[PDB]
C-alpha cells in the first residue's frame, strides 16, 4: 500500500537526511553520515535520485586527490544503485566569507569567488547527470535598509546569473537554472522572496529561457502565501523546473517538515495541481528530520514522505474522477472559467449590450457559486469519506 | 514647519477621507462626503490632486443625466482650485455580481461586464486627465483550493489586460495601467498577491510596456515581506507607475493607516528610496481615517499622513548628507555594490587566480561588515539625536 | 455515513448560517432570515441548539412590545423543534456607539450603557436556558499607543466583570461567563488577545469560578498559535467553558471557515483532544458561508460543519484504539510523561546521585524520541490508509 | 548626549555580545569571548550588570576545581568593575540531552537531571546577587501533535516551579523566578507562548507570589501581540519581574536585533510605559550581534541598545510632558478612562435611567475620539519635530 517506486521520482538532498540536528540553540544529535550510505539507503526507500551541495559531498578545502577520491565513491554508489542526481546547488552560505552574501556581497572579491566556486560545481553536476542548477541566495539580503542597495544588489544578481549563463552556453551544457525563493531567514529580508519575485527577475536576464524557479512549500508559506496558486503561476508561465516539497505550519522560522505536515490541505491541491498539469520533474523532498530522532527515525521521516505523496496523489485522482465532482465543478462554472472572456473581439465586445446597458446585474448576483458543496467535495475525498 | 504644497505630489482616494466608517463588524459612523467638499478640504490641506473610483464620483446605476451631472460638478471643483486628477479605478468588487471576481469570475457573462464597466471609466479618466488606470483584483481569488483554476484563471486575467492594453491603443489614449497587489482579503487568497508577482505577470501581456505596478505599503507588509525592497525591486524593472502609501501593523487585516503609522523605520527607508531614485509619480496615500474620528479626525488624519512623509523627507535627505554617513557606507562597502563583479569577462574571471586557488578566503571572512555603525546613524537622523 | 444528530451537541449563532455577506469591502449578496427559519432548517440538519446576540433577535431599538413579539416568536420555534440555546451573548461592537469599545470605551457613559445592555439580555439568557454567558470584547483595543492606557483598560474590564458577576450572584442564576479572545480586528490591537491572557485576566477577578474561555479556532491561528496546545491549557486550568470551532487559514484577517477547512491537521488534534479529554460543552460554529454562496450553499456549509467534526472524531478515536498507535506512544514515552518527576521529593531529588553527578547524559541524548513514526501513524489515521 | 550610566539599568547577556555567529545555515564568524573581558568592555560602555547561563560561564562538565577557577575569575572582574549580576538562567536546550525539553522532556530522568542542573545554578546567582532566576523553555514543546500531552506537560511544568520554590524557600533565598515566554522556535510550538499563557500558568503554582514574566520584545511579535499591552498587563498583574529588550521585524525567526530596530513606534510605547509606571527593575537586552560584524560592530551594537533606550525615554518625557499633549488626552478622555463606571454600586447602574432607557446613543456616537491629533503629537515628539 502506497510503496514509492523509482517511476515516482522521489529525491532528497543529501543535507536531508544527513542533517546531523545543529540549530541556533542546540549542537547536534546525530553522527555525520557518509554521502555512500544515503544513497544506498535512499534507494532502499524507493528513492529516485538525490541531490547535494558541492560541500554535502566534497568537504570544503579538499584538494582534487581528496574531492577526486570523494566523487569515485559516490560515483561509484550511484552506479551500484541506479541512482538519478537530477538537481545540484552550491553552498554558498555556511562559510563565513559568505556573510554578506554571494553574488550580492558588498564585497567584489567574495562575489568573484562564489561564482568560480559555482562554476566548478556545474562541472560537476553536469558530468553527473543535472538537469538543474538551484540557486538559493539564503545570504543575498539584509537585516537593516541601509546595508543593502537593493537595485544595485540586482545588478549584481543579473550579473552573476548572466555569467553562468554564457559558461553553460560556452560549454555546450544542458543544464538549466532555478532560482529557489525565500522570504527570510537566515537574513532578516532576502532578495528574490517569492516565486514571484524570481520570476519576475527571470524576464530581466540576457538568457531568461535557461532559468526557471525551484519552490519550495514553506518558504512560500513564510510569507502567507498560498502555494498552490504560485505553483500554478510557475506553471502558467512555463518555468516549474524543479519542487522543493515539505511541511510548514505558517508564518515562522523555516521548518522544514516533512511533507504532508504543515498545511494537509494545501499539500492535497499541491499534488492535485502537480499530476493535473502533468508536471514530469523532480518530486524533490527539502526536510528535516527533527533533531528529536535517531537514524531509524530519519529513515521512517524520508518514506513518510514519499508516502504522503502517494496517498495524497491516490485521493486528488479520485477527487478529479468522481462523477459527483464533475458535476459540482460545473455546477460551480470551472468549465466557463476556460472560455475566453471575448474571443469575439474588443469591438464586438463594445457593442454588445447584454455585457452592459442590457445586463441584468441582479439575476448574475444572485446565482450562488456552489463553491461549498465543491470543497465539502474535496474534503470527502481527502479523508476517504 | 513641514508645511504640504502641490508640488510635492500628494494624492488622495475619494475613498480615503469619505470612507464611513463601515467594517465587517460595524455600521459606518459618518455621513457621507460629496466628493466636491473633499476636492476643496483637501486643495486646502495642500494636496496635489485626488483619485476616484467609478463609483466613488457617480451613483451606481446613474442614467446618463445623473452620471453627467455628476462629472460637471467634479470637474467643476478641480478646475476651481487646480486639483489634478493623476489616476482612477475601477470598483469591481462592492457590488454582489462581482462576488467571485470580475476579470475572473467563473461566469464569463460578469467577466464582460466587468470589462465594460471599466472601459467606460478608462474614458472618464483620461478626460479628466489620469495618467494611471488602477487594477486591483480585490476579487480575483478563492476560498478554497477547487474554486479556482488558477492556470485557467490567469488567461482571463492575460485577456482581459490584452483587451484593455488594444482599447487604449486604437482610441490613442497616453494611459497606462498598474496593478495593485494585495496577498488576501477579501478573498481568502488573492491572485497576483505581491509585487513580485505582479511584475511577472506583466511580462506574459501582449505590450508590456502599458503596465506597472501600484504597490500599497501595507499589501507587501501583510505578507511580512520588505515593502522597499520590493519598491526597489520595481524600480529596477522599470515599473514604478504609481504607489500607495499608508501604514500596517504586520500581518493581519489591512489596516490602511496613516502613512507613518505601522513600520516607521520602513516607511523612512521607502521615502529614503523613493527620493534616492528620483521617483516622480504621485505619493498617493491608500488610507482609512479610523472609524473613531469624527471630520475634524479625517482631516487631521489626511494632514499627518502629508507631513510624516514630509519628516521623514527631511531625515533621510539629512542621513544622505551627512559626511559621517558618507564615511560609513564605504566603510560597508555600499561603493565596491555598485561595482560590476566581473566586467572583465568570464574567461578573466575563469583563469584568475586571486578569484579561487588563491583567494584568502579567511582574510576577507574576518572582515567585519560595519553595518550596525551604519544602521545606528540612520536611527540617529530618523530621530533627530 | 457521519450523520449529526443532536447528542453531538453541535450548535450555531443566529449570525453565521444569517450572514448577509457584507465585508469591508462589498454588500450584502443574500437576504436577511428569519431568525425562525435558522430554528427549524438548523434542527432539521441535527443541530443541537442556536446561539444569539440581542441584536440578532430582536432589533435594535425595539420597544417591549415588539421585542417581546421577537422573543415569542423565537421561544416558540424552539419548543415545536426541541433546540436549546446554550450560550448567549450581547452585541456590544456593530452600533458607532460602540466604536472605542463597550466596557472600556474612554467614554464612561458609553461603558454604563454596555452594561446595562448586557445585563438585560442576562435575564433572556438565563430565561431562555443559557448556561454560558459570552463576552467578546471586539471594540476593546486601540489602533495607536496613545489611545488606551491598558492598566486602566483592564481595571475598567476587571470592574464590568466584577459587577456582571455581582448581578448574576444577587439575581440567584446559574449562568457562568467566558471570555471569547481575539488578537486583533475590528481594532489594531484587542485586549486579553488570547486564551493564555485571557485566563491571566480571570484569576485577578472578584469570583474567578465564575470565568472561562470560550476559545475560537480561527482567533488563536490570527497569532500563529497552536489551538490545541492552548485548548489544552484551558483545560488543563479547568475553564473550558465553551468553545468556537472553524476554520482559518493563518495569520490574516479573521475567515471564519467552516470547521475542517483551514488547518486540517489541527483541527483533528483538537477533536482528539475535546474527546479524549471528555469536554462536554457545546460544539458551537462561529463561521461564516462565504459570500460566493446562496442559501442552499449556506446550509451545505453548516452540514459540512458538522461532517467534518464526526470525520475526526472517528478517525481521531481509531487513531487512540489502534495498538500500533499504543506502542508508538510508549515507544515515545507519553506514559513517562505522565509520571511524578519527583514524587520522592525534593530532599531525595537533591541525594540523588543518578539524577546529576551519575546521570549518563550520552546514553540519554542518543535516544531517539521516535516522534516522526508515530505522526506518521497519526496521519494514515487522519486520512483513512 | 545619550550617554549611558549604571544607575540607567542596562544590563547583557554573556551569551549576548558573546554570540559567535552560528546560525542554523551558518558556522561562526567571531571567536569566542572571555566572560571576564566582556564585563570589562560591557562596564566601560556604561552597562549596570551582566546576565548568564551556567555554561556561558562554566564550560559543560567542568570538575569543581575548574568551575571554581571560572568563578573566582568572573567574581574577580565584578569585583573592578562594580558590574551587577541581577539576573542568572540554566541552559536547559543545548545539549542533546534535552532535545525534547528540559522539565517537560518525555523523559523521566531527563526532566530530574533538569531540575538538579538548574538547582545549582540558583546557589551560584543567589550568591552572586541575582534576583531573579529566569526559566527560558525553549525546548518544552513539540513539532507534533501526538508527541506531547500538553496537559501531562503541563503538570509536569507545574511540579518543577513547585519543586524550585520549595528549594528556594527551604534555604532562605529571596531570589524570584521569571518565565521568559516563547511562542516557537527552536521547537514548531512552545508551551506557555506569550506572556498572557505564562501569567496564567503562574497562578496555578503552589506558591504564585514566588514567579512573574521575563518577556521579550521579539517573542510577542513572533505572534503579531503588541508588546506594550502585555507588558502593561504583566504590569497590571504585579509581574513584571525583569523584562528583555530588543528589536524585532515582525512574524518570522527570532531575529534578536538590537533595541529600537525593528517596530520603531512599539519601542517607543514600550519606554513610555516602562517610565511612566515606575518600572525599576532591569533594562535587560537580549539581543544578538549580526555575525556580519567584527567585535568593533558587536559593542557599537551594545552601545546602540542604550542609546535607542534613551533617546526614546528622553522622546516619551516631552510627549508626557507636553501640554499641547496633556490637552489631546483630555481631548480623547484617557481621564474618564481612570474614572469607575459604576462606583454608585450594581443596584445604583440598574436604576439609572441615563444609563439606558435614557441614553442619547446616537449624540455619544456622535463625539469623534481624536485619536488621530493624539497619535500625530506622538509621532512629532518621537521624530523630534
Ligand atoms: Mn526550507
Ligand atoms: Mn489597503
Ligand atoms: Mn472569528
Ligand atoms: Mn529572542
Redesign the interface.
Known sequence: ??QPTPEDRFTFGLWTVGWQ?????????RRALDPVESVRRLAELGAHGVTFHDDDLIPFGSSDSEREEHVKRFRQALDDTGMKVPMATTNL????????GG??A????????A???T??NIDLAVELGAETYVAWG??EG???????????????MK??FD?LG??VT?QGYDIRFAIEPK????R??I???????????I??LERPELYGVNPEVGHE??????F???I??A???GKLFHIDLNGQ???????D??F???????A??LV?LLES?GYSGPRHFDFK?????????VW??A??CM??YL?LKE?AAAFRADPEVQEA?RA???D???????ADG?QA??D?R???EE?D??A?????????????????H????
Chains 1, 2, 3, 4 share one sequence.
Not at 336 to 342: G, K, N, Q, S, V
Request: charged residues 30%; aromatic residues 10%.
Open positions: 500500500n502506497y540536528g545543529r540549530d541556533p540553540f542546540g549542537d547536534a544529535t552560505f555556511t562559510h563565513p566569507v559568505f556573510k554578506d553574488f550580492t558588498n564585497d567584489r572579491d567574495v562575489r568573484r569567488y561564482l568560480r566556486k562554476i566548478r539564503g545570504r539584509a537585516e537593516s535598509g541601509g546595508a543593502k542597495d537593493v537595485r544595485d544588489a540586482l545588478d549584481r550579473e552573476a555569467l554564457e559558461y560556452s522570504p527570510n531567514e537566515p532578516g529580508d532578495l528574490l522572496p517569492t516565486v514571484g519575485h524570481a520570476l519576475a527577475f524576464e530581466r508559506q513564510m510569507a502567507g502565501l498560498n498552490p496558486h504560485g500554478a503561476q506553471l502558467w508561465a505550519n505558517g508564518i515562522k522560522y523555516d521548518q517538515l516533512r504532508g505536515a504543515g498545511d494537509l490541505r494545501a492535497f491541491w492535485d498539469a528530520p527533527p533533531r528529536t530522532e535517531d537514524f531509524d527515525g521512517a521521516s518514506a513518510g508516502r504522503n496517498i485521493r465543478l460551480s462554472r470551472l466557463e472559467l476556460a472560455r475566453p472572456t471575448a474588443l465586445l463594445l454588445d447584454s455585457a452592459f445586463f446585474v441582479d448574475a448576483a444572485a446565482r450562488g457559486m456552489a463553491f461549498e458543496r465543491l470543497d465539502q467535495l474535496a474534503m470527502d481527502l479523508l476517504g469519506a
